[PDB]
């Protein structure tokens, strides 16, 4: 970008929320940064919006995961629009008028009977619901290892923000009277809006692929019971068959066990042998699903791999490749987080500074994994898919020459003890308007001369934010195209009003002969020597 200019939009949609939300009773957002562990700005007030392009599919597939609560917060409540729950401006409408926005979606999730990992109590009160209403209906009660629905009223009872007409609202779907609704012929809530989208995408032109998740970071307890012994496997596999009998629209089901080594929270359970029991569990399911649903329209199976070099060994892909596995998802992120590393760092990046510092999660990169996976595990890049976050990671007390951090400071983000999103960052800290990648209102924007990643910083006590940019996403897409991937995937799709998702289509090389453009906003930030911790010890 030899001496060249670009110009901003005069508004960024600017619907209801944010302009009043600024004053709400725990929105501690200093435009200078803070230890303010809560803030609530809506997505639709810094919005650049989507653009149509020629959608020729002979590329790595651009995809997204989804989670069911916008104002996400531990121990959820009833109702909405009033701090405890809010939609964050995420009406499904922005996808209903842009049905071609993704090449695949990945839904979440189901519980399991007896699985205290998802929840010991409230989900098991929905299971107490089944095991009371079902025999009253003459239907079978279900044992441990069967799948169960999470929230029948929130899943199928509700009608607002899921793109449905108001009268579609059905209030009877509480824990004593819900099982008769439990099939596609009675689809409602978001489970209506997804089925509606699959038709509308095909009605205007081309189709949509639809997977779903079971399990996660706190949600992997009973997998050590399930996989280990046939008597739990039978009830589970019969419940997956019963799910695809009830709901044929889904194309794919994925277990998200964290991890085949140890991995996740202390509520999760793993023996060393479960890393083999998982290969049995998936081969038994693959065999039962091949038996019931044939081959011409069979349901896909994929895995969530660690991006950490020791744990991709424990993931045991070099056995699964011989037992039946469609795709391999490189979740090479959470290499930094606000509290658990002794120094400031980065959620992931394309290129390590040289070394993983104190042998930590920080100073890793996406370059490291594929070099082993393609060669020492022998994997086709067309199975491999690259996962990435749609948010930043904050820290406090930072210095750039020594990376020292305020050891227990829960630095600012969106929601509640969670990450800052890029829209609320451009609203307060960062230029997206005037021909240079830089900070505003007293923030600065840095670029590490070792790793070449970018981060925001501030010259008070030391507010720091690791974040992605239009520059790096424009690069990651052209990288992923040349690096021969089966695809690339967002986490979670409700978090971008179009800032980086436009840059993803523009990065993968989708085109037309625009709402906003960014040429003189693809230049880099201030070239700081952010040393690896080995280069701070030296």
């Amino acid at each position: 970008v030899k001496p060249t200019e670009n110009i901003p939009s005069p508004i960024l949609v600017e619907d209801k929320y944010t302009e009043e939300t600024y004053s709400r009773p725990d929105v501690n957002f200093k435009e200078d940064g803070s230890q303010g562990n809560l803030s609530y700005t809506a997505t639709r007030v810094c919005a650049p919006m989507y653009n149509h392009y020629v959608g020729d599919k002979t590329k790595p597939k651009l995809s997204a995961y989804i989670t069911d609560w916008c104002q996400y917060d531990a121990r959820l409540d009833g109702g909405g629009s009033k701090e405890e729950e809010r939609g964050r401006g995420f009406d499904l409408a922005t996808l209903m008028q842009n049905p071609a926005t993704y090449d695949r979606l990945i839904f979440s999730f189901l519980g399991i009977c007896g699985d205290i990992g998802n929840k010991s109590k409230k989900v098991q009160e929905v299971w107490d619901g089944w095991n009371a209403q079902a025999p009253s209906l003459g239907l079978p009660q279900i044992g441990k290892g069967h799948i169960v629905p999470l929230d029948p009223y929130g899943d199928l009872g509700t009608a607002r923000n899921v793109g449905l007409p108001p009268e579609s609202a059905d209030t009877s779907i509480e824990s004593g009277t819900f099982l008769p609704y439990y099939q596609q012929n009675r689809a409602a809530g978001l489970l209506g809006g997804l089925r509606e989208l699959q038709k509308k995408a095909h009605a205007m032109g081309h189709k949509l692929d639809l997977a779903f998740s079971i399990g996660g970071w706190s949600l992997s307890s009973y997998f050590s019971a399930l996989a280990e012994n046939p008597d739990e496997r039978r009830v589970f596999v019969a419940s997956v068959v019963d799910f695809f009998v009830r709901f044929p629209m889904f194309s794919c089901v994925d277990i998200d066990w964290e991890y085949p080594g140890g991995g996740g929270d202390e509520g999760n359970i793993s023996s060393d042998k479960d890393g083999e029991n998982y290969v049995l569990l998936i081969k038994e399911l693959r065999s039962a699903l091949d038996s019931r649903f044939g081959y011409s329209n069979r349901k896909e199976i994929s895995i969530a791999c660690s991006g950490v070099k020791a744990k991709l060994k424990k993931s045991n892909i070099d056995q699964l490749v011989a037992n039946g596995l469609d795709n391999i998802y490189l979740m090479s992120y959470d290499f930094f987080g606000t509290i658990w590393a002794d120094y400031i760092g980065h959620h992931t990046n394309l290129y390590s500074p040289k070394d993983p510092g104190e042998q930590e999660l920080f100073d890793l990169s996406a370059e490291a994994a594929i070099d082993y996976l393609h060669n020492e595990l022998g994997i086709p890049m067309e199975k491999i898919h690259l996962g990435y976050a749609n948010y930043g990671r904050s820290a406090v007390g930072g210095d750039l020459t020594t990376r020292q951090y305020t050891k227990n400071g829960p630095a600012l983000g969106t929601m509640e003890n969670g990450a800052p999103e890029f829209f609320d960052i451009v609203k307060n800290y960062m230029d997206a308007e005037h021909s240079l990648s830089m900070g505003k209102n007293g923030f600065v924007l840095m670029t590490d001369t070792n790793a070449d990643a970018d981060f925001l910083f501030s010259e008070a006590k030391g507010h720091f934010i690791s974040l992605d940019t239009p520059r790096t996403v424009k690069q990651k897409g052209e990288y992923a195209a040349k690096n021969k991937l089966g695809g690339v995937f967002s986490w979670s799709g409700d978090q971008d009003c179009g800032l980086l998702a436009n840059a993803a289509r523009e990065g993968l090389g989708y085109v037309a002969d625009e709402t906003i453009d960014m040429g003189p906003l693809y230049n880099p930030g201030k070239e700081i020597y952010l040393k690896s911790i080995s280069e701070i010890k030296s």
Binding site: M96, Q97, P99, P165, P166, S168, A187, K200, A203, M204
Partner: protein, 63 residues
């Protein structure tokens, strides 16, 4: 309530009621959820009549 149909029937599903001249009833009935089908089984008694309502507006002019 009717505008809830005209937002998305006219948003994507059909360009206009005149393009319903394509259909046969079973083709049309298959595509629609309860929020359409529970308020839609009457449509072809007047909408196929719409699909021959423009007919002579450019031939009654024979003088």
């Amino acid at each position: 309530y009717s505008q809830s149909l005209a937002d998305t029937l006219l948003g994507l599903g059909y360009r206009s009621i005149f393009d319903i001249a394509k259909v046969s009833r079973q083709r049309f009935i298959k595509r629609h959820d309860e929020s359409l089908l529970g308020n839609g089984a009457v449509i072809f008694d007047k909408a196929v009549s719409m699909a021959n309502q423009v007919l002579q507006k450019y031939r009654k002019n024979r003088l």
